[PDB]
Amino acid sequence: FVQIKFDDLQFFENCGGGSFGSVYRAKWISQDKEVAVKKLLKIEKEAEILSVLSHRNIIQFYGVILEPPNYGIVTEYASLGSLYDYINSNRSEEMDMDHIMTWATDVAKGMHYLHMEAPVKVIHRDLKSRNVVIAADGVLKICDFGASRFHNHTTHSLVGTFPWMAPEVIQSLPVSETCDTYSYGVVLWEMLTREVPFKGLEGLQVAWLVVEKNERLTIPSSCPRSFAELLHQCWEADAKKRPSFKQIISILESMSNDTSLPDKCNSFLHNKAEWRCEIEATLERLKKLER
């Protein structure tokens, strides 16, 4: 627990909404470092356990703000924004298969660390493209991985999170590390299609569809089978039938040695104007499925 004086910071802008859980971008004046600061309504001293986590694909702890009433956590700031903002911009048109693979390896490796490599097993429960950020060198960093255990005020809206929640998370059921595997496959699908998952729908409809009808996000027919089948394993209703992140890492290795995949995938990636109608059709069939 490094301590960071409130006056040691210069606050720039707030994401979230001024509330507890809202993230400020800020300059750490003692250190001349650009930082993120999360507004907490206090700090749990027992939360030291998480201050020892360190991995190039998770956001880096810097220190804590302990000046009542100002309580905050300070971390690195990733220069290039959230994965979400990037995927749903026209910048994502520059993504080739080597890009997808690198970024999906980045997330899978950060998750493998939290699940199996750190001082304490961390199951994230809220992994999603808005919780992954892009450092200056394209390296991805998982955010908010300690939220589900300590500061449960940061998350829950929760209607905006159903497309990434495993079914068992939706039902408040027994939960295993493979709930993060389901959320990852949604992140993968986001990278491949560059769409907002279940765009336009009601959270409760998606919650319902995922849980009762085993509805999953449309996989375009022209998506390479290797990607399609990886998505499928990551989306098994039966959490015990989903891969671990060690297996995902090993799967991405095989895919990246497949000489045929790069043309197949890059073709698919750059023909979005053909197969975007497939996803958009399923969206109206699902919207009309409540009217």
Ligand SMILES: *CCC(=O)N1CC[C@@H](Oc2n[nH]c3ncc(-c4cn(-c5c(F)ccc(NS(=O)(=O)c6cccc(-c7ccccc7)c6)c5F)nn4)cc23)C1
């Ligand atoms: C407003 C629109 C929007 O969403 N965006 C606009 C731009 C983009 O924001 C960006 N761009 N780059 C970014 N880089 C980082 C973040 C960011 C950082 N955090 C943040 C915190 F401020 C605090 C904690 C966490 N995660 S954590 O709670 O799991 C954690 C990590 C490490 C240690 C600890 C800890 C230590 C001791 C005791 C308890 C806990 C906790 C965190 F992610 N959020 N966003 C945003 C960026 C998106």
